[PDB]
UniProtKB/Swiss-Prot annotation, chain B:
It comes from Saccharomyces cerevisiae (strain ATCC 204508 / S288c) (Baker's yeast). The modification N-acetylserine is found at residue 1. Belongs to the V-ATPase G subunit family. Present with 2280 molecules/cell in log phase SD medium. Subunit of the V1 complex of vacuolar(H+)-ATPase (V-ATPase), a multisubunit enzyme composed of a peripheral complex (V1) that hydrolyzes ATP and a membrane integral complex (V0) that translocates protons. V-ATPase is responsible for acidifying and maintaining the pH of intracellular compartments. This is V-type proton ATPase subunit G. V-ATPase is a heteromultimeric enzyme composed of a peripheral catalytic V1 complex (components A to H) attached to an integral membrane V0 proton pore complex (components: a, c, c', c'', d, e, f and VOA1). The chain holds residues 2 to 57 of 114 of the full protein. The gene is VMA10.
UniProtKB/Swiss-Prot annotation, chain C:
Residues 1-13 are annotated as: Interaction with VMA5. This is V-type proton ATPase subunit E. It comes from the Eukaryota. It is found in: Vacuole membrane. Homodimer. V-ATPase is a heteromultimeric enzyme composed of a peripheral catalytic V1 complex (components A to H) attached to an integral membrane V0 proton pore complex (components: a, c, c', c'', d, e, f and VOA1). Interacts with VMA5; the interaction is direct. Interacts with VMA10; the interaction is direct. Interacts with RAV1 and RAV2 components of the RAVE complex, which are essential for the stability and assembly of V-ATPase. The gene is VMA4. Residues 8-38 form a coiled coil. Subunit of the V1 complex of vacuolar(H+)-ATPase (V-ATPase), a multisubunit enzyme composed of a peripheral complex (V1) that hydrolyzes ATP and a membrane integral complex (V0) that translocates protons. V-ATPase is responsible for acidifying and maintaining the pH of intracellular compartments. The chain holds residues 8 to 59 of 233 of the full protein. Present with 16134 molecules/cell in log phase SD medium. Belongs to the V-ATPase E subunit family. Residues 12-31 are annotated as: Interaction with VMA10.
UniProtKB/Swiss-Prot annotation, chain D:
Subunit of the V0 complex of vacuolar(H+)-ATPase (V-ATPase), a multisubunit enzyme composed of a peripheral complex (V1) that hydrolyzes ATP and a membrane integral complex (V0) that translocates protons. V-ATPase is responsible for acidifying and maintaining the pH of intracellular compartments. Is present only in vacuolar V-ATPase complexes; enzymes containing this subunit have a 4-fold higher ratio of proton transport to ATP hydrolysis than complexes containing the Golgi/endosomal isoform and undergo reversible dissociation of V1 and V0 in response to glucose depletion. Glycosylated. Present with 55714 molecules/cell in log phase SD medium. It comes from Saccharomyces cerevisiae (strain ATCC 204508 / S288c). V-ATPase is a heteromultimeric enzyme composed of a peripheral catalytic V1 complex (components A to H) attached to an integral membrane V0 proton pore complex (components: a, c, c', c'', d, e, f and VOA1). It is found in: Vacuole membrane. Belongs to the V-ATPase 116 kDa subunit family. This is V-type proton ATPase subunit a, vacuolar isoform. Disulfide bonds: none annotated.
UniProtKB/Swiss-Prot annotation, chain E:
The keyword Membrane applies. Belongs to the V-ATPase H subunit family. GO terms for cellular component: fungal-type vacuole membrane; Golgi membrane; proton-transporting V-type ATPase complex; vacuolar proton-transporting V-type ATPase complex; vacuolar proton-transporting V-type ATPase, V1 domain. The chain holds residues 320 to 478 of 478 of the full protein. It is found in: Vacuole membrane. This is V-type proton ATPase subunit H. It comes from Saccharomyces cerevisiae (strain ATCC 204508 / S288c). GO terms for biological process: endosomal lumen acidification; Golgi lumen acidification; proton transmembrane transport; vacuolar acidification. Disruption phenotype: Increases the ATPase activity of membrane-detached V-ATPase V1. Abolishes growth at pH 7.5 and in the presence of calcium chloride, abrogates growth at pH 5.0. Present with 22500 molecules/cell in log phase SD medium. Keywords: Hydrogen ion transport, Ion transport, Membrane, Transport, Vacuole. Subunit of the V1 complex of vacuolar(H+)-ATPase (V-ATPase), a multisubunit enzyme composed of a peripheral complex (V1) that hydrolyzes ATP and a membrane integral complex (V0) that translocates protons. V-ATPase is responsible for acidifying and maintaining the pH of intracellular compartments. This subunit is essential for activity, but not assembly, of the enzyme complex. This subunit is also required for silencing the ATPase activity of V-ATPase when V1 is detached from V0.
Length: 168, 56, 52, 113, 159, 112
């Protein structure tokens, strides 16, 4: 589109094994088939290799997908509430507040260099503590933004109440 | 090949169950092996204290 | 779907189940040796305390 | 059958059940294959009206398959008959079905008379 | 039954309704005044089975089921051994064995339908095989009582 | 109202950046756990993000769904431009935890 993207484009995240092959070009590599076999030859590929994890058991892998789906839905609802608060604040520009360039760069260059970098998450703990810490950090940021947005709305209502008594 | 994949998957599941039972029997053997390897330590300190009492 | 893909999915399911069983056997095999030396050290410490 | 190979004891887990449509078994196999890994099967057997389904999964996920199988319009359980205290249970089920036919025949004759 | 049906259709005289109502209370309370354990133990020990007002109730077998259980259900095994021993010695199509076979089939059907642990005593003793063969014979009321006794044990096998 | 607007703007920006990084890490962890749980053997796969232009994601999703649809199944893979999923009565399921119709391979959509 051209109303939600100004510095970033659309991305698709997909994973395949080392023995997978396409049904339209047998006998080729998926890396060269991703860029060279792309539609129109203009598809850009970015590296998104994260660190390897250790599966504890097969029973936790079924609940881990539902917990990651619910945490992804809660993270998407928190990002939609933060975008709704940013659009409701009346400060969103034509490029900023709709693109969210992280680190002062575009979304494709930042997404191409995304290697699972954390500032409080290490590679020695489980993924459940990192997902729970990310969900608690997202819920704390959403509650911290909503707590300031509620006081800003009450301060704007009190300022409108004082402005209505000041003249009218 | 309808029952061949179920037979090979049943043999692989029996090998995985035997591999899990080998680790469970190894941990169950190590649980008694810790006390069996720890119960022999008092026999040297008892005679070592008995030598110090036999000196007096 | 097709019946030919059922054996190809069953082979990867059996290999994943064998990998999970090997991971659980390695976890229990690390846990038993993780606890056994501490239990033997505690029993040896109690026996030395009684001997003293 | 799908000779004693699964009703007398084995290392794999089987899920037998009756269904009136193969689309619910294909949607349950697609949902189980997409949400629980390769822990499904593809079997079809003609019956007298219902169709016999054949599903296979692990021995540690039989409790989670009961909710997804029951919520998917199906009754795929570990054992269809209520006789599983011996190997095989079909010998005792043949005796209970061999006495229930005579008791139902005598009750039907006494009720008709 | 004649006093109970005659109690609803009273006459013009009050002495007939007072006599039928007075005799119906003593007649109904006379059989209910006795103990079920002494009546069942006396009827089973006497070797004479017969119907009664308190013998067709499931509360008597449920109340005497805990008191009868003293040797792994030796009382129900003795009653089933008396019914099967009466079935072997003194074969069916008789006047004497039909009343004890019908009362033993009704009491065995109520005791078997009351608790699910008495089915092992019938299979261990051997009277369960004669219950299936007794239904296909004559005396279709006793065949219906044995059909209910076989249906009570057959109901606990498959649910 | 001015100080709460400025502090709510800065905390909304920092919470939006941390929520975006946590959403990207949760999407990468769910994308790795989906192919890791669904694939099985082997325990190592190549995961990457392909940047498509605007208004051309249907051709890349159709070509990638048609090319990578052989792994999920020959009968379940179908040509779909967008996100073709189950949306009928409760006999069929359509959700992120219980569904009876999805893509032919492990693929997620991340757009802003």
């Amino acid at each position: 589109m051209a109303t939600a993207l100004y510095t970033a484009n659309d991305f698709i995240l997909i994973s395949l094994p080392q023995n997978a092959q396409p049904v339209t070009a047998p006998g080729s590599k998926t890396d060269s088939w991703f860029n060279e076999t792309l539609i129109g030859g203009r598809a850009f590929v970015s590296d998104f290799k994260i660190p390897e994890f250790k599966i504890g058991s097969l029973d936790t892998l079924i609940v881990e997908s539902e917990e990651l789906s619910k945490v992804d839905n809660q993270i998407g609802a928190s990002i939609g509430k933060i975008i709704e608060i940013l659009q409701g604040l009346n400060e969103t520009s034509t490029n900023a507040y709709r693109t969210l360039p992280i680190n002062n760069m575009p979304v494709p260059e930042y997404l191409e260099n995304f290697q699972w970098q954390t500032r409080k998450f290490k590679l020695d703990k489980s993924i459940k503590d990192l997902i729970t810490l990310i969900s608690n950090e997202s819920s704390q940021l959403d509650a911290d933004v909503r707590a300031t947005y509620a006081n800003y709305n009450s301060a704007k209502t009190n300022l409108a109440a004082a402005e209505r008594k000041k003249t009218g | 090949s309808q029952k061949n994949g179920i037979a090979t998957l049943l043999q692989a599941e029996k090998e995985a169950h035997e591999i899990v039972s080998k680790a469970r029997k190894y941990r169950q053997d190590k649980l008694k092996q810790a006390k069996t390897d720890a119960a022999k330590e008092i026999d040297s300190y008892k005679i070592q204290k008995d030598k110090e009492l036999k000196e007096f | 779907l097709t019946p030919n893909q059922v054996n190809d999915e069953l082979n990867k399911m059996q290999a994943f189940i064998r990998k999970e069983a090997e991971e659980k056997a390695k976890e229990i095999q690390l846990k038993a040796d993780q606890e056994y030396e501490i239990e033997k050290t505690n029993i040896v410490r109690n026996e030395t305390n009684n001997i003293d | 059958e799908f000779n004693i190979a699964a009703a007398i004891g084995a290392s794999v887990n089987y899920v037998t059940g009756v269904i009136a449509r193969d689309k619910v078994a294909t949607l349950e196999q697609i949902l189980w294959r997409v949400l629980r890994g390769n822990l499904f099967f593809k079997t079809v057997e003609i019956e007298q009206k219902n169709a016999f389904i054949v599903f296979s999964h692990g021995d540690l996920i039989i409790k989670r398959i009961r909710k997804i199988a029951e919520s998917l319009d199906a009754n795929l359980y570990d054992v269809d008959s209520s006789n599983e205290g011996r190997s095989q249970q079909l010998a005792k089920v043949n005796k209970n079905l061999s006495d229930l036919y005579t008791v139902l025949k005598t009750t039907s004759t006494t009720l008709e008379s | 039954p004649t006093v109970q049906s005659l109690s609803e259709r009273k006459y013009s005289d009050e002495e007939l309704r007072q006599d039928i109502s007075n005799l119906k209370e003593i007649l109904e309370n006379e059989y209910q005044e006795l103990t079920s354990f002494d009546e069942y133990v006396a009827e089973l020990d006497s070797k004479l089975l017969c119907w009664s007002p308190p013998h067709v109730d499931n509360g008597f077998w449920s109340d005497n089921i805990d008191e009868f259980k003293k040797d792994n259900y030796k009382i129900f095994r003795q009653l089933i051994e008396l019914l099967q021993a009466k079935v072997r010695n003194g074969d069916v199509n008789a006047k004497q064995e039909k009343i004890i076979i019908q009362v033993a089939l009704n009491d065995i059907t109520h005791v078997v339908e009351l608790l699910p642990e008495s089915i092992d005593v019938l299979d261990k003793t051997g009277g369960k095989a004669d219950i299936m063969e007794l239904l296909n014979h004559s005396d279709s009321r006793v065949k219906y009582e044995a059909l209910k006794a076989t249906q009570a044990i057959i109901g606990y096998t498959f649910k | 109202e001015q100080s709460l607007r400025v502090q709510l703007v800065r905390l909304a920006k920092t919470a939006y950046v941390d929520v975006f990084i946590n959403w990207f890490h949760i999407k990468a962890l769910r994308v790795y756990v989906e192919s890791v749980l669904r694939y099985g053997l082997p325990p190592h796969f190549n995961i990457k993000i392909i940047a498509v232009p605007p208004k051309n994601l249907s051709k890349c999703k159709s070509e990638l769904i048609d090319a990578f649809g052989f792994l999920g199944g020959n009968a379940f893979m179908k040509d779909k431009k967008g996100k073709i999923n189950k949306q009928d009565t409760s006999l069929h399921q359509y959700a992120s935890l219980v569904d009876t119709e999805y893509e032919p391979f492990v693929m997620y959509i991340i757009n802003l």
